Amino acid sequence: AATTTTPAPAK
Amino acid sequence: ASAPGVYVTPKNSVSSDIISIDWSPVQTAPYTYWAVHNWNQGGEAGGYAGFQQQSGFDENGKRTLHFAVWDPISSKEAIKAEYVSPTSVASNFGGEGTGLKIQTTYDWKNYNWYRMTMRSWQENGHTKFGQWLKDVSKNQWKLIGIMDFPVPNVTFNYGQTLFQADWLGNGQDVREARVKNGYGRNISDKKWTSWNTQSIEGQEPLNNNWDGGATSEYLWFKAGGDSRSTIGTGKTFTLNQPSQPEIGKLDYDVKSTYYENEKLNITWQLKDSSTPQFKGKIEIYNNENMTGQPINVINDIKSYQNGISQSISLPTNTYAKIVLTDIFDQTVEKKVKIKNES
Ligand SMILES: *[C@H]1O[C@H](CO)[C@H](O)[C@H](O)[C@H]1NC(C)=O
Ligand SMILES: *[C@H]1O[C@H](CO)[C@H](O)[C@H](O)[C@H]1NC(C)=O
Ligand SMILES: *[C@H]1O[C@H](CO)[C@H](O)[C@H](O)[C@H]1NC(C)=O
Ligand SMILES: [Zn+2]
């Protein structure tokens, strides 16, 4: 189940 | 439980069709992703690429390259794995988001330099994303993977950054790497932007279990174990790299150029040290000077094709204009007389 997420865009 | 993320972010990146950076691993905790390229966060054709220590602490563990692009926002057409290298595997990912990833077994080594260069281009109404890797010590390029994304006119539009991430929760284990030679090629004017100035920043301003700095040679960063920030929540650092990147040369030998039983065979081999092939074209002329119109043209020779074999009717004396171009749009043209015997 490994996850490698990313940074959210600027709001 | 987890090491804090660290981000290295150029001060001056713009919309690009080529992005390049050099990376060198120093300490390699398992479950570490060095995503050295990132683009279009929350956006159409969002993706990343880099290096993973998937298991173990050293070269005897599972070391990989990584490349992922998230599914199209509107289009129902699938992302296609157009090309995977012999040690590359394409698979669909899921969880909160979906898309295509290419994982590549790659025996990269501590204190060696690896140049990951990505290119995006328009082909047949779609956008292609390609991953190339130069082993700097071996002086050898390899094509890793090409994804075919079913939406035109997307590129590395924004969000250029590198991160080092612990994906499993082993904050006791230190991870450290170095980067230099960050460049993008501008969509606007096809000129290079030098990422000579980058910020190094912990993901969590309240977590100081990471550190970073720069020598005249490289930026470095680590997280986990006894890491403790010497630079507060983050700091900017400049390398003295040239404003235009040092680009090598395209260099190849034609291996065969012969016509026999109405079949034309033309093959070539790039030199070990050559920049890698992006595309090819071959014009065939009935005259040595290659005046007038070619009698035949072989178009759309791919990055991953090193020859052609075509059924074709030619006169006695034909000449081939072989036009290869590398991933940096450098073109090398050879004129070879076609031999009427194998
Ligand atoms: C991120 O990396 C992990 C660890 O290998 C998994 O492969 C995961 O599926 C990856 N996520 C994406 C979007 O590629
Ligand atoms: C991705 O998002 C998760 C939260 O969903 C964690 O914040 C993780 O640390 C993030 N990874 C990076 C590299 O920012
Ligand atoms: C992080 O970036 C990737 C592309 O690199 C995806 O767009 C992903 O959905 C983004 N995560 C968030 C929280 O926006
Ligand atoms: Zn389509």
Documented resolution in Å: 1.7
Minimum-distance CB partner of A3 among B41, B42, B95: B95
- Which residue ranges does chain B devote to CATH 2.60.120? 6-238
Minimum-distance CB partner of B41 among A1, A2, A8: A8
Minimum-distance CB partner of B165 among A1, A4, A8: A4
DSSP-assigned letter for residue A2: -
Q: B163: Cβ below 6 Å to ligand 2?
A: yes
- Which residue ranges does chain B devote to CATH 2.60.40.3580? 252-337
HEC secondary structure over chain B: CCCCCEEEEECCCCCEEEEEEEEEEEEECCCEEEEEEEECCCCCCCEEEEEEEEECCCCCCEEEEEEEEECCCCCCCCCEEEEECCCEEEEEECCCCCEEEEEEECCCCCCCCEEEEEEEEEECCEEEEEEEEEECCCCEEEEEEEEEECCCCCCECCCCCEEEEECCCCCCCCEEEEEEEEEEEECCCCCEEECCEEEEEECCCCCCCEEEEECCCCEEEEECCCCCCCCCCEEEEECCCCCCCCCCCCCEEEEEEEEECCEEEEEEEECCCCCCEEEEEEEEECCCCCCCCCCEEEEEECCCCCEEEEECCCCCCCEEEEEEEECCCCEEEEEEECECCC
Interface residues on B facing A, Cβ-Cβ cutoff 8 A: 7, 31, 33, 35, 38, 41-43, 46, 48, 66, 95-96, 158-159, 161, 163, 165, 167-168
* Cα–Cα dist B125/B111, whole Å: 41
Task: Give the Cα-Cα-Cα angle B249, B258, B333 (nearest 5 degrees).
Answer: 25
Radius of gyration of chain B (CA): 22
Q: A5: Cβ below 6 Å to ligand 2?
A: yes
The answer to whether B46 contacts A6, with C-beta atoms less than 8 Å apart, is: yes
State the method: X-ray
The hierarchical CATH code for the domain B6-238 is: 2.60.120
Q: Does A11 touch chain B (CB under 8 A)?
A: no
The hierarchical CATH code for the domain B252-337 is: 2.60.40.3580
